[PDB]
Each structure stands twice: as C-alpha cells, then as structure tokens.
C-alpha cells in the first residue's frame, strides 16, 4: 500500500471535442465545472461527443513500441532500444446516431438537404482537440490532447437487444511545441508540499477600501478595517463555484492569513497611507 486516494475505478466519464489547439480547463477548474454543459465554463469551445458505450470504455492503446536489449559480443546486456516509433491512440465507442457522432465517424456531411447525411469516396482529414474527463466519486481525471486525428476503428454495430455503436480511433499528433497529451489533477501531479497560505498586509494604511482578484476576477470592495470574517465573506461571494465554506481566513494584528481552493492577488487600493495594502504567497 501507499496512496489509496490515487486508485481509480472509471465508473462514469465524459468525452469532448474542440478546434485543433484549444486549451482544456485548468486543474483547479476541472474540480468544479458542470460536465454536462460545456457552454457554461470559461475555457470555451468544447462540445460533448454525445452518448458513449456503457460497457467498452475508452481504450488508451498504442501501435509500435517493439524493443530489443542491445547485447555486447561478450553477452553483456547493455541497454533497451525501441525499433518502431510509439503511436499512441484512444478508441471511443459512440452510441448515438445524430450528426454529432456521424461527423466524428464518417467526417463532414456531404449532403446539403435537411434530413440526409451523405458519404463520398475521397480521403478525409478529421483533426480535433480531445478532452476525456473520468469521474470516480469526488475524484476527476482529465486527459487532454491538442490534436487528435479521428477515423473509423471498426464497422457499425447493430443488434436486436443492445445499443448500436460507431467505434472511432483518436490518434494523437504533434502541434506547435505543446505536449502530445496531458493528464489533469491538481492533487496528483506536480502536487504542492502543503496547503498554500497567502499573507495580506494592510501596510499601515488608514481609511478607504481595497479589491482582491481572487480566482482571476474582481472581488467586492473591502474596507481597510475589515476583520477576518468580513474578508472570508468578501472572498466567498464573487465565487466562480467555490462557496464561502471552502476558504479560511485567520490573523495576528495587521497581518491576515488567507487560504482556499483558488489563487489570490490585489487589483485596486484607495492608497490612503503607508505602503498601501499588499499580498504575498
């Protein structure tokens, strides 16, 4: 045993696409976005791929990767070497027959008339950005790729007593010096050694008000004399999803310890005395 919190059952999940090169939700956003409404969140451009197979979850496969140990003439096992370049992919089983799913499987609709999806004999280029969110109780994985090529993985499945399927292979491709793909959790990758506490110092000012940029948007203006509970509510009001109960404010004299889920910074100050108000990590 080591970290039971990192052990994963892929009980439910979501699949999205966007234009090539578009950014995913940040690790701190993924923990609170509404997964069924991608038009609601600040990293715009994501659309849901529709229903996906309930059995036959996304398979994160690869082609290539065959390897040799290189041996010396005297039977010394020197190093292991790749003979063929690893081409990573994911296979996704689509299970609705709307234009949303057919455009991933066949490429763009070749018919202009209402109620018809047409297909022709040419070659199709079908590049997308791809996001998969896997939900495991209150844990949320993201997988993101900036560029994946889409193709038919296998034929259309039809049955008398199971959902039909449209199996697609998404194959990860290089784009503009980014990573080929990224996994996403604030708690599991590049983790902080301890919970971050910010320091707010009033700087010897007297009278007036000041305005934090908590989570990258402006707070409601805070008076110079505000106590820790007054700051707790002023941060816990212009939320972006993080309720008041998620934060913690404590103090000693003119120095306030601010802590919570998102970042803290100072935007505006009345500048009534001393240095003015300031904030540090």
């Amino acid at each position: 045993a080591l970290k039971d919190d990192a052990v994963l059952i892929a009980a439910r999940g979501y699949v999205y696409t966007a234009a090539v090169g578009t950014a995913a939700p940040t690790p701190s956003q993924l923990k609170l976005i509404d997964l069924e409404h991608p038009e609601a969140w600040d990293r715009t451009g994501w659309d849901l791929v529709g229903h996906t197979s309930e059995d036959d979850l996304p398979e994160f496969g690869f082609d290539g990767g065959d390897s040799e140990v290189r041996g010396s003439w005297q039977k010394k096992k020197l190093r292991e070497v790749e003979t063929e370049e690893i081409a990573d992919y994911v296979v996704i089983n689509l299970t609705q027959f709307d234009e949303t799913a057919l455009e991933l499987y066949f490429g763009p609709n070749q018919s202009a008339t209402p109620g018809i999806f047409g297909v022709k004999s040419g070659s199709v280029v079908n590049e997308r950005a791809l996001l998969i969110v896997i939900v495991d109780n209150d844990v949320r994985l993201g997988f993101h790729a900036r560029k994946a090529s889409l193709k038919r993985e296998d034929a259309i499945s039809l049955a008398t007593d199971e959902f039909g399927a449209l199996p697609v292979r998404a194959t990860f491709l290089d784009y503009q010096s980014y990573n080929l793909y990224e996994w996403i959790e604030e708690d599991w990758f590049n983790a902080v050694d301890a919970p971050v506490v910010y320091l707010l110092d009033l700087g010897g000012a007297t009278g007036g008000d000041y305005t934090l940029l908590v989570g990258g948007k402006s707070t409601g203006d805070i008076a110079y004399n505000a106590n820790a509970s007054a700051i707790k509510t002023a941060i816990g009001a212009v939320d972006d999803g993080v309720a008041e109960s998620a934060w913690t404010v404590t103090a000693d004299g003119s120095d306030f310890e601010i802590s919570g889920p998102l970042a803290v910074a100072l935007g505006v100050d009345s500048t009534t005395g001393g240095s003015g108000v300031t904030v540090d990590v």
Binding site: G107, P108, G122, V124, V125, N126, R128, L150
Partner: protein, 152 residues
C-alpha cells in the same frame, strides 16, 4: 477542422484519329486505373567525373531523357457496343507507334497542359480466363513522350 479531399483533376486522351476519352469520368467506359509512373518531373541523366585523387567529383552535364509513362486503364464489360471487346478495340484505335496521341491534364489552380504520347510496347491484357467473360479488364500501357515536356 474536418475536410474531404476531392480534387478537380481532369484526365483526357485525344487519340490519333481525334477520338476522345475522359479517363476521370469514364463516359466511354474506360478509367485510369491506379498506379501511374512518369507524370510530374521527366527523367534526367546527370554526369559527374570522379578522376584523380582529389575529394569529391566534378559536374559535366545534365540531359532530360524520354518519358516512359507506365499506366493502366480499367475497361468495364457492359452490353451491346459497350462490351469490353468493343471498348478495348476503340481504346486500341486511339494509339500508334508512328503518330502522337495527346494526354490532357487540367486542374483548377494550374489550368490545362498536354503531353504528346506514343506506344512504346503493345498494349497488354492478362488472360487467365477469356477476358470477354470477365466483369472488368485492365489494359497495361507502356507509352513514350519523345518530346518530354507538357505544352499549353
């Protein structure tokens, strides 16, 4: 994001008696049949001399050679004068060793050019079984352009 690659490329042959074939649309029952060698750049012989003991070589000459175009055509076996036999003989009548046919290529973004072409070897069909009994037959073409460029 997503796209269909559907080029406007038109391939036509004008035969030595002025008979025309559209090898893209196959309105005469004949189509250009996959692998083509010898469109694009013509073959060149570059001569270098490697004499004495100094490092590397000297350039002497380069010459454009004849084009050897190698291609096939797929001939559909339909009814009446649209049988494979009537079409492969109409195809054969368009070509000569002594007279030039023209192969015309047209694109939207580069326009129209043509190549003057002759038989270099006799057109050939494989005959595992009677070709009149086959559904389609491929006739294999080895053709020469002795004037190797494409003309407006």
């Amino acid at each position: 994001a997503s796209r269909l690659l559907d080029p406007d490329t038109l391939v036509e042959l004008e035969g030595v008696n002025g008979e025309w074939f559209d090898l893209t649309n196959g309105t005469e029952g004949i189509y250009l049949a996959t692998e083509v060698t010898g469109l694009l750049d013509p073959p060149v012989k570059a001569t270098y001399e490697e004499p004495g003991n100094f490092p590397g070589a000297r350039y002497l000459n380069h010459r454009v050679l004849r084009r050897d175009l190698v291609f096939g055509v797929e001939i559909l076996n339909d009814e009446n004068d649209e049988t494979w036999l009537r079409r492969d003989s109409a195809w054969r009548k368009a070509w000569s060793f002594k007279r030039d046919a023209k192969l015309h290529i047209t694109t939207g973004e580069s326009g129209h050019r043509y190549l003057k072409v002759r038989l270099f070897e006799s057109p050939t069909t494989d005959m595992v079984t009677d070709p009149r009994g086959r559904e389609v037959n491929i006739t294999k073409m080895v053709v020469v352009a002795g004037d190797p460029f494409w003309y407006e």
